[PDB]
RNA sequence: GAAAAGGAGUGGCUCUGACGGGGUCAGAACUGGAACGGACGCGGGGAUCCCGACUGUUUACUAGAAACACAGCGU
RNA sequence: GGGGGGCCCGGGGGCGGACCGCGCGUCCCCGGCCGCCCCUGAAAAGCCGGGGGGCCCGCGCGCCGUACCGACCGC
RNA sequence: ACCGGGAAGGGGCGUGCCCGCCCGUCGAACGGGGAGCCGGCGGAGACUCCGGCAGGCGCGGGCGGAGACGCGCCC
């Protein structure tokens, strides 16, 4: 049976720190606890080990990524643009 | 009875190299016996796992035969790593000469 | 399309005491049980630097064994061996044969080296640069 | 300290590796004091008899029961 | 494009319905050595050393080798599995054609 | 909020059931000045107003607070 | 998965050195996992392995501390 | 007296060659660190004595396996 209605994993904080901070942390902490898909392993086993460091627990690659998620939107866009600029440098 | 004992080392500050166990002696007495720390065994240079075949003893106290394995890169690579290196070398030779 | 394990093929050894060493398939064995094997004759020791200013130095050590084919890597190279004639069933578990077999294959390998035969076969593969 | 088979015991005797032998009665214990270790053998008296018939005269043996 | 990929779909389905095939690198190697493999078909994230030796073994076997244009998850889905598949080896084609 | 507020039981002895040698948990009859957490250990409670959000820090030797710090916010 | 094997494991047993069983629990060390961090949790002497290349019996182990005490600081 | 790399900064041996960029045998009686147990004896000492049993560091008179794996030095 469901145990809380809204607070989710922020129920560890009790009544402290106010509503806006707890609302921000629910999102942040869910993101940083999630399992991600290993871009090499093929499997969903990547977990965070430090702020920007992600390890695949199956194939054991280590990767550099975001603070609280494996990929970031700026990096997605930058990688796409750099790939396009390379391809334009191939005649 | 009373089985309480006093410290065996120079000082009583209980660090990780000053740990004892207790044992009964032939003279009916409770004695303290030091518990040495156990050194790790060598690990793979490529993947960092324990090398198979070497006991967890400092190599100064092992005979030469006991400190080695019988394969090229015997104590340095685990064998999967050796296989991978052989394949890399040969196939890269094949793809660098004759296209 | 076509099988590769044939009795003149040169392979690289992958596991065991002779890993990363070149050998030739003396024979192929059927697949009944325990898998797939092959009689294999290989080089355990190559000769070494000989300046002008020597028998021990220029001797050649071989080995014959039955090996799992899953522990082999075939090649393009090939050696037209003369060892099929030498009886390949007395090689195994008949040690009295096998030591003399090694002797009579050592002589021939050193001979091929003297006539400068099979440059690819008698050279060393570079590992872990 | 360690235990020994009788033929190795006679090797030790015949190459002068022992300094003193002791017979202990109780199955008889034969105790051999060498440079490195004290070796022990356990034999019935019947076999102790022949081992001492074969005992070395360059070898001090001493008896013991009490 | 769409015509060609839907043909690839139809032929993979036909092979797995009525035909002989193997899923996995170890079986792929054993069959390529024997020369029983009509076709070999890989994924785009196959480990590069494994890919190198497969391509070399296939050049000696004259066995054709192709690339699926999707991850090992995609190849697992396409042959009808819930697990990742790096190499699919097709041994007999049954009611398919292997015109790809 | 909350142990909110408020109620009821609890000893000894003779038995019974449940869990795979081991205690726990549940139930019944009898009995004692109308007694039973029998010493020991161990929250009094509630309706409100002012100040500071909170845990923390401080005038060693007359001030522990509404003072300082704090996460957050802004220049 | 199943069948057969290899290596490590501060431990246990038998023989040496040299009375018999059965239990709940406590302390200490060890093991495999799992969780946490805008915190990620010393260094060196010394000893050893790999690749490439060139080539049993005797004797000894120096210097310094070592008694006792909450007998210490607060006249 | 305070402050500090930009200095032609030392070794192997065996002649004569060869290698070389530039600090401290200061700083821990809890960190690292080869190797000790039992029994006994004295008014006052013991992991130190005595007896017994060990351990460490020194000095002198190329093969097996299918495989995982098993069984002298110097740069
Ligand atoms: K009662
Ligand atoms: K305050
Ligand atoms: K508190
Ligand atoms: K306060
Ligand atoms: K005051
Ligand atoms: K105060
Ligand atoms: K206060
Ligand atoms: K106040
Ligand atoms: K203050
Ligand atoms: K190496
Ligand atoms: K003393
Ligand atoms: K000055
Ligand atoms: K010093
Ligand atoms: K220091
Ligand atoms: K210290
Ligand atoms: K020290
Ligand atoms: Mg306050
Ligand atoms: Mg005050
Ligand atoms: Mg004392
Ligand atoms: Mg110390
Ligand atoms: Mg004393």
CSV table of C-alpha atoms in Angstrom, one decimal, chain C residues 22 77 112 116-124:
chain,number,residue,atom,x,y,z
C,22,UNK,CA,52.9,-19.4,-33.7
C,77,UNK,CA,50.1,-17.7,-43.6
C,112,UNK,CA,64.3,-24.2,-42.3
C,116,UNK,CA,65.7,-18.8,-44.7
C,117,UNK,CA,62.2,-20.3,-45.1
C,118,UNK,CA,58.9,-19.0,-43.9
C,119,UNK,CA,59.9,-15.5,-42.7
C,120,UNK,CA,56.4,-14.8,-41.2
C,121,UNK,CA,56.4,-18.1,-39.3
C,122,UNK,CA,59.8,-17.8,-37.7
C,123,UNK,CA,59.4,-14.2,-36.5
C,124,UNK,CA,58.1,-13.0,-33.1
